[PDB]
Amino acid sequence: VQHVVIGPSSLIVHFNEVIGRGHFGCVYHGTLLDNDGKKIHCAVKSLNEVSQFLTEGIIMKDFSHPNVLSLLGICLRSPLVVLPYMKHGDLRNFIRNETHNPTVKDLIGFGLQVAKGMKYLASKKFVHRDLAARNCMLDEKFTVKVADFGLARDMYDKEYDKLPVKWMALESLQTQKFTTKSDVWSFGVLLWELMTRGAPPYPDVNTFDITVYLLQGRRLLQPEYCPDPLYEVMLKCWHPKAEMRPSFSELVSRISAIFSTFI
Numbered sequence: 506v507q508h509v510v511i512g513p514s515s516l517i518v519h520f521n522e523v524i525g526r527g528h529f530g531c532v533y534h535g536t537l538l539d540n541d542g543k544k545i546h547c548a549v550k551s552l553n554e555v556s557q558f559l560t561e562g563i564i565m566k567d568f569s570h571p572n573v574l575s576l577l578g579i580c581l582r583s584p585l586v587v588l589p590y591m592k593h594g595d596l597r598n599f600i601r602n603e604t605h606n607p608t609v610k611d612l613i614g615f616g617l618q619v620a621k622g623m624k625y626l627a628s629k630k631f632v633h634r635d636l637a638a639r640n641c642m643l644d645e646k647f648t649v650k651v652a653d654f655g656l657a658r659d660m661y662d663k664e665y666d667k668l669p670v671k672w673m674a675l676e677s678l679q680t681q682k683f684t685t686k687s688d689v690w691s692f693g694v695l696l697w698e699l700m701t702r703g704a705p706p707y708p709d710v711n712t713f714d715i716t717v718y719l720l721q722g723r724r725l726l727q728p729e730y731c732p733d734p735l736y737e738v739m740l741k742c743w744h745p746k747a748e749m750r751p752s753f754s755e756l757v758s759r760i761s762a763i764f765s766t767f768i
């Protein structure tokens with residue numbers, strides 16, 4: 506924690522500007538100062554046991570990838586988690602917004618960015634457990650950051666019942682076993698959210714019903730603007746046998762090929 510401590514004098518937290526709400530606390534717009542006096546935009550996560558949470562999440566300072574959320578630091582005083590501000594907020598609200606019009610290629614490009622971030626996390630043997638479009642952020646350059654892990658972990662939406670059962674693999678619903686292969690299943694649902702522009706998966710299925718539903722021989726339907734090879738990728742992500750699901754390295758390779766076919 507020593508190398509990532511932020512002095513309370515160097516942090517301005519705007520408690521009036523709430524930009525996110527979670528069960529553990531709120532996200533606020535903040536301001537950090539650099540050695541030269543330049544203001545850096547923050548997202549300050551509040552935390553309301555605490556030592557255990559910081560112990561579990563301090564591994565995030567060692568992660569560094571352009572598609573993975575980084576940690577700016579921790580302000581000790583209840584501790585505050587300092588994260589980089591993500592101008593366009595969460596990926597799900599972005600694709601449901603009406604100020605921007607992402608093309609089918611842009612949506613596939615967002616999925617490819619997530620797959621690159623996940624490929625990095627899987628190479629570090631890190632299992633996300635809650636991969637979903639609501640849990641990825643978009644910065645000022647429209648770069649996707651896989652977020653909601655370590656110190657940033659929280660439930661930021663009401664899509665839990667708490668577990669995100671509609672994004673969970675069949676073996677995780679049955680035995681509560683989470684692996685990189687169950688993150689590949691969640692990644693499939695995330696591609697489907699991207700291709701439907703943020704539609705809720707299985708809308709007429711109650712969260713308690715999902716296991717029986719999947720076991721009947723059912724999967725999410727192909728969205729109307731989803732290319733066939735991308736729907737095949739989603740179907741491979743949802744393979745009933747975890748070991749038969751593509752790796753994130755294979756997903757990056759395959760999705761980059763599909764992305765390249767669009768003008």
Ligand SMILES: CN1CCC(COc2cnc(-c3cccc(Cn4nc(-c5cccc(C#N)c5)ccc4=O)c3)nc2)CC1
Pocket residue numbers: 524525526532548550574588589590591592593594595597639640641642652653654657658661662
């Ligand atoms: C209209 N609105 C005004 C504010 C604008 C900027 O808002 C921002 C909101 N949040 C951050 C931020 C950055 C780094 C880390 C986190 C923590 N974190 N939060 C979420 C999160 C936040 C809000 C809603 C939902 C959901 N569902 C999910 C997911 C994963 C995660 O790790 C938050 N930055 C900017 C966007 C447009």
